[PDB]
């Protein structure tokens, strides 16, 4: 036990708040009491989001070192790239982003998809944004390394930050701290969360939550709603991270498997489905809380699905984990026509 | 000055946090110490913003009586209409929003300005978005009353929420509370702010801050940066709201004038000048903080210009007020091309 033995650099206002989505509760049958951990209300750094939690434990190394460039990677509307740019700015360092094509840009958006959303924000923050177009892979890419070798030859000291930080040694520490927070908040709010619903694609977030909740023997409370539509590698990598992070923080527990629903990943990574959009509309319509079509949207549809199929015990307190990602909504304006009548 | 005398309804996480933009301060020649009270990180209701703070003192009057629909008005990319849509989605009411044509939509943003950004979000929250052609104006609009009659003719009980909640009778109370928070936060920071810089269009925000700071005789610390490009009315309406709010709370002092730097509104409301774009970029590149081309980008360029001309005492602590607006940044992507390295 102990994430405390690792250096942390503050990038958020502190413990992310928890929302009481009581109105969305009744709309779903008053079967459960839905709540939301707002990681999308993280800090003042370009809208916040889950990646900021992860970066807090990575920054120390960046600063202690003497790097001069923060190089990350993702797909078009990648949320991480936007927050890494925000970090480089705050650290007074250069930034090189790689926006590959991981989502089949729905024709009805082939225009704004590359000019708006999160990619616009990275440019405004002055990062060297490079629009590449390679396949989707929640793993190491054969371009991210090139950029690295590139800046090195130029005479710079580049700092690597893989997709989702999932393959960074400390990629899972941030959400371990997330668990510590929830436990403390349950006591302040006086509300015990029976389950934790969170989206998953590259790992680190879920894994950190697993290894962290395990500190209290509550790994099982976790319910990871897939969104990568590749349960294969996705569930394996998350597990590889869950075990490693566990070792770092001292938890002996061994993760062999975890609840990873996969009925809402379709039709593909980045592309929603009638259900996804319906979840966003419902959540937005009921709680005034916005969710995107890529991550938080699907994980929200799954949440509403489970509440339907009386999956949770009657009167259970479920903690929905809003990891952010709403700034990409603009690259999906076509999926949301105006209310009928 | 008893503002607590008025009923308040929770819409934010509590007192907005204050960021220490020490990097930007250094970047600008270490002339002053810049801070930023984050109204843009005040709630989980669709990104949040200044309107929400205003609304907290208006919601009580709503739910109290029997109103079916909430109706507001603003430009195509209004932030208030987007937040009202959330407040509506939350208070479990109907929402009809009038989006007037307050901005000469740049040719490069014509096929986006009305489908992306804030207008989009307001639609996801199931608001009845009505796009009207009427032009810019911070005063009571015809289309407004027309809809108030329309609905009231169809057999409903709409609640009138004018632009910026400025014309509303309780529109100023919100930021009178801001002032309160400021004085308290000065106590917890162990410092005192010499000046407060904030954008100003419809007037309710500044008027609130003015009437509020007056409770402590510090109204002169306020520096409003205009973004309307219509000095007279904005100054006159702000001055009007400030005096009414002054009575409500209990402040005797009457405002006959206030500091309104009109140097940066150019070329007009809703359109940025090269200085605005430069400011947005400088803040983003220095702090990772996002400002918009319509409101905060201009108040920020005003802040920067004032610091250059040594307007503040050396080592002065200046509190910049971030009122949000960044969500609309998606309708102005043409203005921020990828920087070069
Ligand atoms: C809102 C939101 N929800 C979930 C996730 C996924 O996190 P995990 O990879 O830790 O499962 C992201 C990530 N973002 C990436 C990006 O490019 O933005 C893939 C890294 C997210 O932004
Ligand atoms: C980011 C931002 N900054 C300043 C203002 C103006 O404040 P005042 O008019 O209350 O001084 C708005 C308002 N909004 C309106 C809208 O239609 O959104 C005009 C009401 C704002 O959104």
Curated annotation (Swiss-Prot), chains A, B:
Its cofactor is pyridoxal 5'-phosphate. The keyword Metal-binding does not apply. The modification N-acetylserine is found at residue 1. GO terms for molecular function: 1-aminocyclopropane-1-carboxylate deaminase activity; D-cysteine desulfhydrase activity; pyridoxal phosphate binding. It holds the Pfam family PALP. The active site is at 78 (nucleophile). Gene3D superfamilies: 3.40.50.1100. Keywords: Acetylation, Hydrolase, Pyridoxal phosphate. The modification N6-(pyridoxal phosphate)lysine is found at residue 51. Homodimer. This is 1-aminocyclopropane-1-carboxylate deaminase. It comes from Cyberlindnera saturnus (Yeast).
